[PDB]
């Protein structure tokens, strides 16, 4: 319960550049 892993960022905006 104390070991929260690095969760996924599921809302990735579009990158420009």
């Amino acid at each position, epitope marked *: *319960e*104390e*070991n*929260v*892993e*690095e*969760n*996924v*960022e*599921e*809302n990735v905006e579009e990158n420009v550049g």
Partner: antibody, heavy 116, light 109 residues
Framework: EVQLVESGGGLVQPGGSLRLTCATSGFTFGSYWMTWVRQAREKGLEWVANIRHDGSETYYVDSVKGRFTISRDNANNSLFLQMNNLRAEDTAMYYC?????????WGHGTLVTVSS | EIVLTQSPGTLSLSPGARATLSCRASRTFTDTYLAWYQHKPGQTPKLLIHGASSRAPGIPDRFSGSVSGTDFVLTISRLEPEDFAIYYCQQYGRSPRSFGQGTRLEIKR
């Protein structure tokens, strides 16, 4: 009983170095994530860094990237926070906590003062 | 990054009253990896609620939490003299697992 004891740290000048140690006992060390948290004078709590159980993944707050390094030795039950190139705004009380989510078990906290 | 902003800045109530502390995020909440902490000056911080609505071990029943949409609320049903302190919310789903700026719960007179 879960025991967390922060050591190291003290008075240092800008650009100096300090190595914090969080000697743990009372639980399987290599089975838990570990976390460093600090709080400066007249400011709020700030999450600094955490490390996976096997030390293969480390994450940092932006203000300490490239300067602070979190590490661990699971055979010695010790969590480390190598602080290089310290700044005046790094002056705070540094706590080590168990886990990576809701931090239940905290240490007493060691004081780091950076000033010229 | 998601930034947590707590409301109000200072909460002034009397013992026995009902306390409601807010914690709003830059965008809509998408998980329950949220916590509430209590901090008294000179004393070690203390977890009150994890998982957005689960009381930590030993926390009295008068502490309860809930999350909905863009607001994360801590509720103290009746204020005990030992409850006036500083309260921080926190997200811990992923990096950075940052806190709120803090809410000062003072005594009203």
């Amino acid at each position: 009983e879960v025991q967390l004891v922060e050591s190291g740290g003290g008075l240092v000048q800008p650009g100096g170095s300090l190595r914090l140690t969080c000697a743990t006992s009372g639980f399987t060390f290599g089975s838990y994530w570990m976390t460093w948290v600090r709080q400066a004078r007249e400011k709020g709590l700030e999450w600094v860094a955490n490390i996976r159980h096997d030390g293969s993944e480390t994450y940092y707050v932006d203000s300490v990237k490239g300067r602070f390094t979190i590490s661990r030795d699971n055979a010695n039950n010790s969590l480390f926070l190598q602080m290089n190139n310290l700044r005046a705004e790094d002056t705070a009380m540094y706590y080590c906590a168990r886990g990576s989510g809701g931090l239940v078990h905290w240490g007493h906290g060691t004081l780091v003062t950076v000033s010229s | 990054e998601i930034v947590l902003t707590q409301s109000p800045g200072t909460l002034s109530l009397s013992p026995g009253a009902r306390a409601t502390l807010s914690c709003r995020a830059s965008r809509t909440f998408t998980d329950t990896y949220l916590a509430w902490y209590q901090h008294k000056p000179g004393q070690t911080p203390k977890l009150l609620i994890h998982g957005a609505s689960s009381r930590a071990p030993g926390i009295p029943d008068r502490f309860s939490g809930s999350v909905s949409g863009t607001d994360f609320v801590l509720t103290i049903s009746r204020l005990e003299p030992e409850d006036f302190a500083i309260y921080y919310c926190q997200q811990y789903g992923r990096s950075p697992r940052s806190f709120g700026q803090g809410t000062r719960l003072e005594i009203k007179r």
